[PDB]
Nucleic acid binder design. Sequence first.
DNA 1: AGGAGGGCGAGGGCGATGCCACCTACGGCAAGCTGACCCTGAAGTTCATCTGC
Length: 117
Amino acid sequence: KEQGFAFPIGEQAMFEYTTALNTLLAGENRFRIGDVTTVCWGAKRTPLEESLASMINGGGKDNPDAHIDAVKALYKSLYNGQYCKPDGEDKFYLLGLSPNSARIVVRFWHETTVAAL
DNA sequence: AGGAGGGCGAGGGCGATGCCACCTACGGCAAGCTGACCCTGAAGTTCATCTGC
C-alpha cells in the first residue's frame, strides 16, 4: 500500500479524529495516569428518561466532555484520597496514548464504564 | 555357762518470704547526587546501485 493506504481511512474520518485528538490534548480532557498522558471523553450517553429530561431544556445533549469529570476526579482522587466506590452504567472512553520517539503509543483503551475502569 | 542391749512414739506444731517506685531521662535517624545517558519518527527528498535499452 506504501503509506496511508495500509489503513484505508477517509478524509471525513481522518481529519475528524485528528482534530478531535488535537482538541482533547489541549483542554480539560488531558490528564496523566502514571507517566502517560491519557485523553478521556464520554461515550454515547443514554437517551435520558422522561423524569430527568423534562427539567432539562433541549433536552439531554450528548456532550462528549461532560460526564468525564467522574473518571477525572477518580484518577485525581487516587492522588487526593477522596475515592468512593462508583456505580457505572455510564461508559467513558479512555484512550491511553503515550509518546515514544514520535509515534502515538496506545497504552490504555477501555470502553467499559467508570465502575470497571 | 545363759543371759537380755529397748519396749514407743511422738520430730513441727503457726504465720508471715515484701512493704514503695522508679525501668527511664535528651536528641539526633539524614546529609548530597543521581532518577539518565544514545536511538529509533512523519514525510519528502537524494545518492549509487539493479536492470533494461
